[PDB]
Amino acid sequence: TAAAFDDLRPRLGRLTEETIDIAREVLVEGKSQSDVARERGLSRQRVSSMVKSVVSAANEIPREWQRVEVWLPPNLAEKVRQMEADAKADVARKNQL
Amino acid sequence: RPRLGRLTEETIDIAREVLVEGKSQSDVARERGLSRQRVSSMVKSVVSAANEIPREWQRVEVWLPPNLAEKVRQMEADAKADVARKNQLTDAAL
DNA sequence: TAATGTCAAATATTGACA
DNA sequence: TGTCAATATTTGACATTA
């Protein structure tokens, strides 16, 4: 991952900067998981899960999708909510090989 | 009937810690001895009046294909401008 | 087995809708 | 208050190398 990372940041919401900074040392800077885990006082399992979060977030949402923050009646708030689930579901089974 | 000036002073005091002082909801909750659910609803009433939308309305932030993203972006419009019509004409249920 | 990375389970906290 | 999902974490086990 190069400047592809810096383009993943919007979709890297819900994660913190340390979780993002840490995974960037691995995916872009080429550092090792176990090395940075010792650098920032962490289990090597967390740094595994940290990047896997950053990585999966890439596969979960294509860069074409748009981020929309909207206030709705409770009836229709579930609809858009549920349709994103069905929309992420449809992207998910395409990853297959 | 106004909406921001309608609320109890404590809610505006609670919500000021969250939104202005940057404090967390659970923080001000334990600070003023209330549940973290009460502070969430307390703040929400402020954000819904500042959003001039119904209080029962729920926010939804979501990633969606652009086709369906303009679909939902239109729903907010056909809701903001739906209640806007119900306020002046439902009194004409005569 | 030393070293790394992943799968797994399980903890605490927050902020959401009921 | 109950509950859930998503964070922030942990140890333990385990496949895989050199």
Author numbering:
A (entry chain B): 2 to 98
B (entry chain A): 10 to 103
From the paper:
ArdK is a 102 amino acid protein encoded by the broad host range conjugative plasmid R388. In R388, ArdK represses the expression of five genes by its binding to their respective promoters (PardC, Porf7, Pssb, Porf12 and Porf14). The KorA family of transcriptional regulators includes plasmid-borne repressors involved in plasmid stability and conjugation. Our structural analyses show that ArdK, a member of this family, can form a symmetric dimer similar to that observed for KorA, yet it binds direct sequence repeats as a non-symmetric dimer.
